[PDB]
Design an enzyme around this catalytic site. Structure first.
Site, PDB file in Angstrom:
ATOM      1  N   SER A 179       0.800  -1.220   0.000  1.00 17.27           N
ATOM      2  CA  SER A 179       0.000   0.000   0.000  1.00 17.27           C
ATOM      3  C   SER A 179       0.835   1.274   0.000  1.00 17.27           C
ATOM      4  O   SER A 179       0.259   2.365  -0.059  1.00 17.27           O
ATOM      5  CB  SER A 179      -0.944   0.021   1.204  1.00 17.27           C
ATOM      6  OG  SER A 179      -2.213  -0.514   0.869  1.00 17.27           O
TER       7      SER A 179
ATOM      8  N   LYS B 286       0.206   3.740  -2.844  1.00 17.21           N
ATOM      9  CA  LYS B 286      -0.876   4.715  -2.834  1.00 17.21           C
ATOM     10  C   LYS B 286      -0.363   6.139  -2.656  1.00 17.21           C
ATOM     11  O   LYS B 286      -1.083   7.087  -2.981  1.00 17.21           O
ATOM     12  CB  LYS B 286      -1.880   4.375  -1.731  1.00 17.21           C
ATOM     13  CG  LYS B 286      -2.683   3.106  -1.987  1.00 17.21           C
ATOM     14  CD  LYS B 286      -3.322   2.595  -0.703  1.00 17.21           C
ATOM     15  CE  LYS B 286      -4.295   1.450  -0.954  1.00 17.21           C
ATOM     16  NZ  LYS B 286      -3.668   0.294  -1.650  1.00 17.21           N
TER      17      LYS B 286
ATOM     18  N   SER C 155      -5.787   3.013   3.708  1.00 15.73           N
ATOM     19  CA  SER C 155      -5.249   2.175   2.635  1.00 15.73           C
ATOM     20  C   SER C 155      -6.370   1.502   1.850  1.00 15.73           C
ATOM     21  O   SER C 155      -6.267   0.340   1.452  1.00 15.73           O
ATOM     22  CB  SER C 155      -4.271   1.138   3.183  1.00 15.73           C
ATOM     23  OG  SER C 155      -2.987   1.704   3.376  1.00 15.73           O
TER      24      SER C 155
ATOM     25  N   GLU D 235      -4.799  -3.111  -7.559  1.00 15.48           N
ATOM     26  CA  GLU D 235      -4.973  -3.966  -6.393  1.00 15.48           C
ATOM     27  C   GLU D 235      -5.779  -5.212  -6.737  1.00 15.48           C
ATOM     28  O   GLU D 235      -5.525  -6.285  -6.181  1.00 15.48           O
ATOM     29  CB  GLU D 235      -5.588  -3.179  -5.249  1.00 15.48           C
ATOM     30  CG  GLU D 235      -4.549  -2.275  -4.588  1.00 15.48           C
ATOM     31  CD  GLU D 235      -3.694  -3.003  -3.560  1.00 15.48           C
ATOM     32  OE1 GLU D 235      -3.539  -4.239  -3.664  1.00 15.48           O
ATOM     33  OE2 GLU D 235      -3.168  -2.331  -2.654  1.00 15.48           O
TER      34      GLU D 235
END
Length: 255
Positions: free
Chosen positions: A46, A49, A99, A135
């Site tokens: 994550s 991101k 997240s 993802e």
């Protein structure tokens, strides 16, 4: 003499941890850099991101998107049990703080997918951050080097990466990060401001944290990236490695 020997001290903290560990520590104001395997591209989880959020905000800064644009999210995109509208800003918020994977994939969708995020990183001066998968697709990892991520954070902290309101917005999100508060913050003195973004693979396969540490007085800021990939240590011991790396970097740069 502290910033001097930080490398030897960090290498002893991670000794026998196994796996692949990338560390980059950069004093924002002077540029003083300490790195161990700093140019090795390691799995982000994550942490990706954060590049995503910068890519989204650059879209706004380049007149192709706006912060208050309403975006519709549905359960088919999987907070998300009804068809709900969220502004672009609200998508970045939840993607950075929690997240959140549904909002992140909508943001990727908006900017043109993983390859577009990778191109933006290159255009901004970070050619060693490779976003290749959504993802859902990862559900070939997204990879990035510790030095590239640290240098990105330096420019964010300096006011060079984004417009001032976007920099304050993104750093505000990173202040409220709710998933890794015993990582970069774990061993710092009480009252140390920290903006961060974590990354975690299941069962300890990946433990990451990148962020900015505010030093006391007017001693500056530290951009720090720690990427731990495939270590033999328990999840808790990997998080303690990040906390102690962060405290060692803090002590070396503080009077």
């Amino acid at each position: 003499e502290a910033i001097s020997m930080l490398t030897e001290r960090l290498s002893s903290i991670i000794n026998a941890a196994g796996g692949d560990i990338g560390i980059a520590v950069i004093h924002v104001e002077t540029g003083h850099t300490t790195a161990i395997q700093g140019t090795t591209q390691l799995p982000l989880q994550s942490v990706f991101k954060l590049p995503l959020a910068i890519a989204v905000l650059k879209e706004i800064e380049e007149n192709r998107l706006q912060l208050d644009r309403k975006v519709r999210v549905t359960p088919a995109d999987v907070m998300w049990r009804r068809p709900i509208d969220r502004t672009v800003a609200q998508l970045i918020e939840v993607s950075i703080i929690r997240s959140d994977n549904t909002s992140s994939d909508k943001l990727l969708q908006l900017v043109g997918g993983p390859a577009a995020v990778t191109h933006r990183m290159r255009a901004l001066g970070f050619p060693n951050i490779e976003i290749v998968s959504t993802e859902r697709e990862f559900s070939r990892p997204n990879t990035g080097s510790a030095e590239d991520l640290a240098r990105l954070l330096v420019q964010l902290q300096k006011g060079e990466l984004l417009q001032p309101q976007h920099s304050a917005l993104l750093l505000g999100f990173m202040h409220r990060a709710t998933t890794g508060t015993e990582r970069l913050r774990g061993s710092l003195p009480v009252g140390t401001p920290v903006a961060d973004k974590t990354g975690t693979g299941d069962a300890g396969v990946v433990t990451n944290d990148v962020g900015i540490i505010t030093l006391p007085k007017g001693q500056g800021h530290l951009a720090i990236a720690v990427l731990i990939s495939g270590s033999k240590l328990s999840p808790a011991a990997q998080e303690k490695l990040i906390a102690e790396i962060a405290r060692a970097a803090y002590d070396a740069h503080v009077s």
